[PDB]
Amino acid sequence: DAKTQVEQAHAYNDALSAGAVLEANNHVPTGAGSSKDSSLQYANILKANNEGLMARLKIPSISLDLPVYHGTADDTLLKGLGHLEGTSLPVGGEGTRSVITGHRGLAEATMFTNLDKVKTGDSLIVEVFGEVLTYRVTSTKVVEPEETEALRVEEGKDLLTLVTCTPLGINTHRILLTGERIYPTP
Ligand SMILES: [Cl-]
Ligand SMILES: [Cl-]
């Protein structure tokens, strides 16, 4: 059912027009995608356990290794990183953009506090249902509270986008970065 869950994820990504927006003065990114097939149920795809675990994300340059969950509810984001519903599931594919968010500034956990230390050329590594996908960081950006940033699919690229979030009512700059799929020798 790992084989199948990954095939289901690709089918979901095929039906989805991925998109997101970082809204002005919003503490979390906003999902902004649509699906040509709503029978592919998000919660049930890449469902590794009953708590909604999807994947793990590693960023060796900042010693990060965290669980990735379905969705970006408040409680989820205190357990780990949230996948932003409306964006591609993190199984790759041409014309995909997967968005994952996590807190900065907490005392109780690091989460994405050191995301600003990530630089172009660094690896982002997704471990998902037994597969390992590597992305190389190609852009980093500070998005100030007053700015709005659309996150759209780019051509036939296979993109992973990470963005910081905060608790509700904490209005501060976001760190946004994107990596593109690469293929290290196995
Ligand atoms: Cl593809
Ligand atoms: Cl805290």
Whichever domain contains 21, its CATH number is 2.40.260.10
Distance CA 71, CA 100 (A): 9
Host domain of residue 150: 2-182
Distance CA 164, CA 145 (A): 12
- The contacts of residue 164 (CB under 8 Å, 6+ apart) are 101, 102, 103, 104, 112, 115, 174, 175, 176
Q: Which ligand is nearest to the CA of 109?
A: 2
Q: Which ligand is nearest to the CA of 91?
A: 1
Other beta carbons within 10 angstroms of residue 144's beta carbon come to 12
Contact 141, 119 (CB under 8 A): no
Contact 88, 97 (CB under 8 A): yes
Q: How many structural domains compose the chain?
A: 1
Q: Where are the beta strands (DSSP E) in the chain?
A: 16-17, 19-22, 30-31, 34-35, 53-59, 64-70, 81-83, 96-103, 123-128, 131-143, 149-152, 158-165, 174-182
Question: What is the residue whose two structure tokens read 């982002």?
Answer: 124
Q: Which ligand is nearest to the CA of 13?
A: 1
Centroid of ligand 2 to alpha carbon of 169 (angstroms): 14
Question: What is the residue whose two structure tokens read 């027009």?
Answer: 17
**PDB experimental method:** X-ray
What does each C-alpha distance from 118 to 77, 90, 112, 152, 173 come to in angstroms? Answer: 20, 19, 10, 22, 16
DSSP notation for 82-107 = EE-BTB--SS--TTEEEEEEEESS-S
Distance CA 135, CA 49 (A): 25
- The contacts of residue 154 (CB under 8 Å, 6+ apart) are 97
Distance CA 68, CA 104 (A): 16
Contact 94, 13 (CB under 8 A): no
Contact 107, 136 (CB under 8 A): no
Centroid of ligand 2 to alpha carbon of 128 (angstroms): 28
Strand partners, 184: none
Question: What is the residue whose two structure tokens read 């409680």?
Answer: 75
Q: Which ligand is nearest to the CA of 103?
A: 2
